[PDB]
Amino acid sequence: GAMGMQQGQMAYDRAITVFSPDGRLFQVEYAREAVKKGSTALGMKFANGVLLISDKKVRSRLIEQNSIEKIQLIDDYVAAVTSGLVADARVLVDFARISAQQEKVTYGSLVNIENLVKRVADQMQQYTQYGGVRPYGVSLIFAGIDQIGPRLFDCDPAGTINEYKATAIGSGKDAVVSFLEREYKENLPEKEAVTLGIKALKSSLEEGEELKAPEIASITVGNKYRIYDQEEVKKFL
Amino acid sequence: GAMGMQQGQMAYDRAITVFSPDGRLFQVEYAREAVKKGSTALGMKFANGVLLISDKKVRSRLIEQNSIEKIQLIDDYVAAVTSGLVADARVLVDFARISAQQEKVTYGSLVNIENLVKRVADQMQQYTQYGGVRPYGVSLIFAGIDQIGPRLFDCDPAGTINEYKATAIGSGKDAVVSFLEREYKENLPEKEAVTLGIKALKSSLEEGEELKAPEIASITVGNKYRIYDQEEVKKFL
Amino acid sequence: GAMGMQQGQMAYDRAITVFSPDGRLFQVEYAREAVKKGSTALGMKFANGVLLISDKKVRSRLIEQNSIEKIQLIDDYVAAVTSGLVADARVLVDFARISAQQEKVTYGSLVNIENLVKRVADQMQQYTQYGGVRPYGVSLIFAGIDQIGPRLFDCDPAGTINEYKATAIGSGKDAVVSFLEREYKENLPEKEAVTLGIKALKSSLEEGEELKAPEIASITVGNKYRIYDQEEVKKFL
Amino acid sequence: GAMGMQQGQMAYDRAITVFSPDGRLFQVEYAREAVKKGSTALGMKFANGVLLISDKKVRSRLIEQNSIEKIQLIDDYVAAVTSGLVADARVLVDFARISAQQEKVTYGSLVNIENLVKRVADQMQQYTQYGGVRPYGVSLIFAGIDQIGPRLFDCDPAGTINEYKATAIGSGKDAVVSFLEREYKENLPEKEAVTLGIKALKSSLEEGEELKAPEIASITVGNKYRIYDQEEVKKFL
Amino acid sequence: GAMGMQQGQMAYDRAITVFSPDGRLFQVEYAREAVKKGSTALGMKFANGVLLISDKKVRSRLIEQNSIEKIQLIDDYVAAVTSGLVADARVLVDFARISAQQEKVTYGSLVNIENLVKRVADQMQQYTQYGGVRPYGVSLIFAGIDQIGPRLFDCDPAGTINEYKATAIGSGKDAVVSFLEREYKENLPEKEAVTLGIKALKSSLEEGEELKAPEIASITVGNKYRIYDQEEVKKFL
Amino acid sequence: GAMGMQQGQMAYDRAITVFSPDGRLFQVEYAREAVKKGSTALGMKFANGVLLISDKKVRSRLIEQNSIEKIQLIDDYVAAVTSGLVADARVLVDFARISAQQEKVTYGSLVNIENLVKRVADQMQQYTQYGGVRPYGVSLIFAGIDQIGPRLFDCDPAGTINEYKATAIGSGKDAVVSFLEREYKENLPEKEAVTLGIKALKSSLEEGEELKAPEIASITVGNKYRIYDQEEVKKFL
Amino acid sequence: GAMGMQQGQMAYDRAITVFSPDGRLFQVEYAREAVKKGSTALGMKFANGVLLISDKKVRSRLIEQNSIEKIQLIDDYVAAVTSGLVADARVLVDFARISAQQEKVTYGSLVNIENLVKRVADQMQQYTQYGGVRPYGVSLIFAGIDQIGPRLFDCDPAGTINEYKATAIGSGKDAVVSFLEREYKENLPEKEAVTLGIKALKSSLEEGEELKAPEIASITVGNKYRIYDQEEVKKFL
Incomplete structure (x- = not known):
């Protein structure tokens, strides 16, 4: 898509x-x-775990491919993918990271992931009312499996947080969200889940035909996160 | 020593x-x-307890149902429901929670609930005058039974607090409140009280016919709070 | 004589x-x-004591009657009544309460009440010039009997303070004040004093006929404050 | 591509x-x-002391007369009288008071009163330049006898201080000052001094005929301050 | 960008x-x-290392030549070059320097260079949202070989960071970046890599014909950085 | 929303x-x-010392003559005269006084007076740049004899400092400075020096004829400052 | 003109x-x-040292000649000359003086003079971005001989620093700089160096013919600074 900022005033x-x-x-x-x-x-709960999938749209040959990871791990059992101002996202992510460690070192275990997100949320909400400082212009979603089970939450710049069965974020939110809103299947087994997902992702942003190379990761109850390899993702592509 | 924030850099x-x-x-x-x-x-005192009821208006099939709990517990004997900027409501809730704990740990018992609300109210009142900081865009009501008995309070962004026999808040306040103002029955036994309530809630917001799935909970002197289960509420619905 | 600086500016x-x-x-x-x-x-000195009386105008049946106390106790021998921004008024009262305790715990006794009012006044005055902070939107009058005798002080948002023989505040000030200004009887015994008062209050705000239920309290030299019970005030009503 | 003084101011x-x-x-x-x-x-040095006099203009019968003392003692040998924002005046006075005590507890004796006023004036001067804070809207005059002898100083909101032989302040300054500027008698004996003063006071504010009840206090070298009682003042009146 | 910019307030x-x-x-x-x-x-990864090259555009004979080093060392194994406000660049460079030492002293070794740049970036990011403070008007690119292997990143005023196969910065960014975008050869051996580079640089800024004297440095896996000598650079020129 | 308020910002x-x-x-x-x-x-170095002279313009009879000293001592061997905002002058003077004492207590002696002025000058310079604060509205001249010999310095609100052979400050600076500029006699003996000065001072401000009573003081190498008595000055007058 | 301000800005x-x-x-x-x-x-490196030269333009006969030293020492082996807001310059110079002592006291010797200037530069740069504070309105050049050899640097309000072979600063910068830019002779021996200099300085500012009395100082590797005496410079004049 063409890029350029006409407004400069x-x-x-x-x-x-x-x-x-x-x-x-x-x-x-x-x-x-x-x-x-x-x-x-986007990301969605499935069979006995949850997955994450983002559109990795690349430009130059000169970029270090993979190095532009959109899906980031906060810990082996929980990740987050983000959208909006890159710098703000990063720093926000690192905050979640250390924050996660804290709970681990004090209680000995991150029992409820919902709490981790609440904290980073509260961080954001602070900038919403504390005078002299600019709000974090980034929305992100955390997903992974905790003591309660497979979980999925999203967070916007206002610090609003909710739990979903499936959801998306970024540019093509409305589009992709509608697709699932209609064709989302409850306990869809992984292989099909990723399919429904990549399909949904496609339709949305795919006003420009080429889906390019998506970045996909998934975790299932009982074990650690798995990041899909170039070939594996291309298989579903 | 004086109570205030050291951070002023x-x-x-x-x-x-x-x-x-x-x-x-x-x-x-x-x-x-x-x-x-x-x-x-809204909420109201009845027989020998008090009940709270909120309209749980849902959108997507993709939301995690119950997870969007509007009636939140502060402690086994006191709950509160809020209305306004969601983020602001959450943070203000947690404040009351720890604030509650504090009274418990020093005095050994949260004797007067009125006091709990006063503290959270003062918190809000502070942002009403201390220059550089946006006020809390939220109102909420606390309900529960204390040393004095079943008690009902409401609080607005101004820090104004009042005790009621019955009241409401949020969108259809004026409406529902008038219904009660008219058909509120003093010592209505729980079953009938929840009914009058749900009826009152209906009329109000029910310009759009469907009441959907309301969220209701209650407590009665002598014991802890009881959250109504899906079917039980559907029974009055 | 060196002194450190907490803030550079x-x-x-x-x-x-x-x-x-x-x-x-x-x-x-x-x-x-x-x-x-x-x-x-309003309030007024009489025979061997001072009385406070406020118009308790109520609305909905749903309000918890008495809970909306306007005349407040700072200590068994000193009460205050306020008018203006409710939140502000409350917070200001509590300050006066603790401040009262302070003198008590250090000197062992609240010898002069004038001093108590001065301290809360100064509090108010500071917001009059200290830049970034909104003034306290409230006025209040303190009454009780101290080491010197029965005392009646008032205090405005400016932090201005004066001692009266009789006075009022709030909406119908100019009115009720004129009435007393004319028919105030110096050493009027209690019963008659409360009469003149209620009559005065009436005349004033009673552009709308119904005086409703006034809230009245009185203390006399030698003992603690006495709050009038519903029937007793209705007797004068 | 050119620079110049486009704006004169x-x-x-x-x-x-x-x-x-x-x-x-x-x-x-x-x-x-x-x-x-x-x-x-106003105030003026006389025979072997100095005296202060202020116009106590009263309104309602409901004010507690004397309690509205305008001349205030800083210590048994030094008084001050004020004019301007009443709250500001009070807080300034107390400062003067604690400050006077400070010198006494460190040096063992307030040797030169000029210093006292110098410290309060510096207090005010600070608000004349330290950014965020409104200046004290008041002017006061200090009088009393010190190690050097009888002394009289005045102080304005700018922090300016000067010693006079006689002077005044407040509303009718210009008027009263002129009268003295003309008929002021060097070493006038107290009785005639207070006369010359009350006359000077009269003429000035006395556009409105009635001088009402003036407030007058005087001290003479060798002893403590004396405040005139109602009858005594009424005698010169 | 042409200097024909419109001057304004x-x-x-x-x-x-x-x-x-x-x-x-x-x-x-x-x-x-x-x-x-x-x-x-600009800079680009090559055979078994990475090189940096900047256009050292000199004016007067009176300048102390070399002293205007644009390529600066952060440590024998990592260098960076900058563009934008000179002052901002320098301060920013030293931070990175000390920051590097800190890693070295605590962990004992600078294992991953990406982290170093991340730290300097977050620094800038801070000034993106923390109120009263002007953002760093500078962008720089770090290059060198770490535990992973040869690395190259860039960083802008926004604190945004990316790793490249090759990239440039400054005035002729768009031009030179295109050249490489087209003619960049993957595993180009040093001698040719520096050539392709110097050609790319030339083309870009060389609207004004003379390339002048370029500043170039290169490091290869296994050893420390090597800065090219005047003669050596002139050989490729 | 918005009743109609939008004009004010x-x-x-x-x-x-x-x-x-x-x-x-x-x-x-x-x-x-x-x-x-x-x-x-003004002030000017002469034979073997330096002298200071200020026009003491008095108004009312009611002022305490001498008490309005314009020439002030910093220490027995150094004095200063000031002009501008009275309040700012005083506070500044006191700063120099303690500042003087400080050097004495640490080194045991105020060796170089130029240094004393530089310190009071820096104080001023600080307010020229440190944001939220109004600069000192005053200029003054320091003169006396130090380890080096008789000295004379001037200082303006900007914090600028210069040493002179003779100079003046205040209202008629330009005038008097010019008279000297022409008729100043290098090693003029005291008696004549004060004459040349008074003359110079006269001319300048003497558009209004009467020189009134000037305030003058002079110190000579080897001893302490001497302030001229009413009659003595009157002699040259 | 009026108590109220017409401008509401x-x-x-x-x-x-x-x-x-x-x-x-x-x-x-x-x-x-x-x-x-x-x-x-201006200043320029020569044979085996470096020399400084500033135009000492004087006005009144009343100024204390030499006392207006424009070339100032930081330490016997390094001096600087400044131009711009005198006050700012001074404080800036003292900073560099103490700053020099600091390095000497920690390392036992000021090895690289470049570092000294850099520190004073960063100080400056700070006011370039730290909000509430006016930048230093001054530029200066440091010259002296260090461990590396004779060195010459210049520094502006922006905090930009550069090393030169010869340079100037202040009013006639462009002028004198061109002269050097053309007729500057590399290893010109001192006598001739000072000449080329004085001629250069002359041409520049000498639109007004008279060069007046130039202030000149020089140092040579191996020894401490030498300031030229009135006659010596007059010899070149």
Whole structure:
């Protein structure tokens, strides 16, 4: 797709920590915009585990391929994929990472993953009201299996968090989300799950035909995360 | 020693702290707006306990149902339900939770619930005047039975707190409240109370006919809180 | 005589700290407005004590009656009634409560009540010039009997303080104040004092006929404060 | 591709800690306005002491008379009288008080009163330049006998201090000062001194005929301050 | 970018930490501009190492030649080059230096270079959201061989980081990046690699014919960095 | 929403720590203006010492004459005279005083007076750049005899310091400085020196004829400062 | 003109730490201007040393000649000359002096003079980005001989530093720099070096014919600095 920023003027500039007369945080709103322009990714609970899949859209030959990993591990049993401002995502991810370690070193085990996400969420929410500082313009989803079972959560710049059966984020959210909204199959076995997924991913962003090379990872109850190899993903491609 | 935040290294530019020529905190007003756009919930004292009921309006098949719990526990004998900016509600809930724990660990027992709400209220009141920081865009109600007996309180973004015999909050407040204002029956036994309630909740938000699946829980003097199961609630539905 | 510096800069660009070209603090003025929009109340010295009386105007049946106490106790011998921003009023009261305890624990006795009011006044005054922080939108009057005798003080958002023989505050101030200004009887015995008072309160806010249920408390030299029970006040009503 | 002095003068931005292009601190100017609107008072050295006198203009019968003391003791040998924002005045006075005690506990004796006033003035001067904070809107005069002998000083919102033979402050300054400037008698004996003063006070504010009840206090070398009782003052009245 | 830019004042930027209504950080944008106006430089992986090359464009005879080193060493095994605000670049370079030592002293060895750059990047990222502080108007590329093997990354004012097979930075970025994008040869042996590079650099900035004297350095797996001598560089020139 | 309020806007910026497009600090300039409107004073090295002389322009009879000292001692061998904002002068003077003592207590002797001034000068220079603070609106001249010999220095609000043979400051600076500029006699003997001075001072400010009573003091190498008595000065007058 | 200000401009676009849409720091730019309006000075490496030369332009006979030293020592082997805001220059110089002592006291010897300048540069650079603080309006050049040999560096308000063979600064920079740029002789022996210099300085600022009295100092490898005496320079003049 063609790229270019026609707008270069500051234009309208509200302020920070100010509700609009209609009860809205415009800054948090503008933040959301940034994440809409991000890459597209999704994940869904299946058989006895959960998978993650993102559209790895590459440009130059000169990029170090794989090095542009979109799906990142926070720990062997839990990962997250993100979209929006790259820098903000990164730092936010590292926070989750250490945060995860903390619970492990104090309680001896990350029993409930829901909690890990709540913390990073709270981090984000702080910037939503604490005066002099810019909100994190990134949305990300955590998924993996904890003591309770296979889990999937998403988080937006406002610090909002929810649990899904399946969901997506980034540019093609609306599209891909609708596809699942209709064709999502409950206890779909992995092989088919990834299929339904890649299909859904396709339809969405695939206004531009070529799906390119998606990045896919999955974890099933009982064991650690598995990242699909170039060939394995291409198989479903 | 004085209670306050040591962190003050960060400089603050713009800040909320201006009374209008007519004696009003516009920021706190704008905040109130955000809560009106929140879901609808209510509660009321009855026979020998109190109950809480929230309208659990769901969208996608892809959401993890129950996980979107609106009625949250503070402790086995006190629960609260909130309305407004979701993020703000969550963080304000956890504050009350630990704050609750604190009274328990020093005094050995949370004797007066009124006090619990007062603390969380004051928290909110602080952002009402301390310059550089956006107020909490949320309102909530605490319900439970304490040393004094079944108690019902509500709280707005201004930090204003009041005890009720029955009340509501969120979107259809004015509506549902009027129904009760009219048909509220003093010592209505639980079964009939939950009914009157659900009826009241219906009328209000029910401009859109379908009541969907309401979330209801109750507690009665002498014991801990009881969350109604899917079928039980569907029974009154 | 060396002294360390916690903050490198004494202060930066902040609001709420500007004299109008005519020598007035407009914010403090606007703050006063909000208090004008509060409930009406008054107090007056009599025979050998002082009494406080406030108009308890109630709305819904759903309100927990008494729980909406306007006359508050700071200590068995000193009570205060407030008008203006409710949240602000509360927080200010608690400050006065602990502050009272403070003098007690150090000197072993609250010898002069004037001093207690001065301390809470100063608290208010600070927000009058210390930049980034909104003034307390509330006024209140303290009454009780100290080492000197029965005492009646009032205090506005400015932090201004005066001692009266009789006075009122809130919405119907100018009105009720005129009434006393005219028909206030110096050493009026209690029964008659409460009469003159209630009559005064009535005349004032009673543009709307029904006085409703007034909240009244009285203390006399030698003993602790006495709050009037529903029937007793209704007797004068 | 060219630079020059396009703007002769810089446009006005804020107002706190900003010199006007004519080298004036407008804020401090406005402050002064506030003091013009305050009550009128004066003081003058006499035979072997100095005296203070302030116009105690009372309104309602409901005010606790004397309690509205305008002349305030800093210590048995030094008093002060104030004019301007009443709250600001009070807090400043107490500062003067603790400060006076400070010198006494370290040096064992307040040898030179000039110093005392120097410290309070420096207090005010600080608010004249330290960014975020509104200046004290008040002007006061200190009088009392010290190691050097009877002394009289005045202080304005700018932190300016001077010693007079006689002077005044408040509303009718210009008027009263002129009267003295003309008929002031060098070593006038107390009785005639207080007369010359009350007359001077009269003329000034006495556009409105009734001098009402003045407040007068005096000290003479060798002993402690004396406040005139109602009858005594009424005698010169 | 042509110097024919339109001169103007500052935009309507209230403070640095505002998202535009389109989800963009304008300040970070403006910073990027500053980098485009810097010198041109590049680097690329080759045979068994990596090389760096920057256009050392000199003016006066009075400059101390070599002293204007654009290629700087962070450690014998890692170098970096920069473009944009010189001052910002330098400070940024030293941080990286000390940062590198720290890793060395705690772990005993700089195992993965990606981490080093990550640290310097997060530094910049901070100034992207933390209020009162101007972002680093600079972009730099780190290159050298670590535990994994030869590595090359780039970093911009936004703190965004990527690893390349080859890439450039500064003024003629777009031009030279294209050249390589087309004629870049995978495992090109040093001598030819430096040639392809110098040709690419030439083409790019060489609108003004003379390539002048380029600054080039290269390291290979197994040993320390080697900076080319004047004569050696002139050989490829 | 929005009843109709939108005309008024809230915003805060800077205008003190801001260079003009032409390279000048408007605030410091404005500061200078304030000093121009101050009293006129001068000083000049003579035979074997230095003398200071200020025009003590008095108004009302009610002022305490001498107490309005314009020439102030810093230590028995060094004095200074100031002009500009009275309040800022004083505080600044005291700073020099303790600053003087400091060197004495550490090195045992104030060897070089030039250093003393540099310190008070730096204090001033600091407020020229440190944001949130209004510069000192004053200029002064330091004179006395140090280890090197008789010295004379001047200092302005900007923190600029120069040593002179003779100079003046205040209102009629330009005038008096010119008279000297022409008729200044190098090693003029005291009696004549004070004459040349008074003459020079006269001419300048003497557009208004009457020189009134000048304040003069002089010190000569080998001993302490001498302040001229009313009659003595009157002799040259 | 009036108590009320006609302009309601609460804030303006001009501020600090803001990149312009074209990537420039306007504040740093304006700072440069002020250095342009400063005196003119230069330096150049010669035979086996380096020399400094500044135009000591004097006004009144009343100035203390030599006392206005423009060339200042940091230590017997390194001196610097500055141009721009005098006050800023001074404090900046003292910083480098103590800064030098620091290295000497820790390492036992100032090995590389480049480091010294770099430290003073970073100090400067900080005010380039740390929000609330005006940048240093001054540039200076350091010259001396260190462990590497004779060295010459220049430094601007931006914190940019460069080593030269010869250079100048201040008002007539461009002028004198060109002269050198053309007639500068590499290993010119001192006597001739100073000549080429004085001639160069002359040509430049000498639009006004009279070169007045130039201030010149030089050092040669192997020994300490030598400042030329009035007559010696007059010999070259």
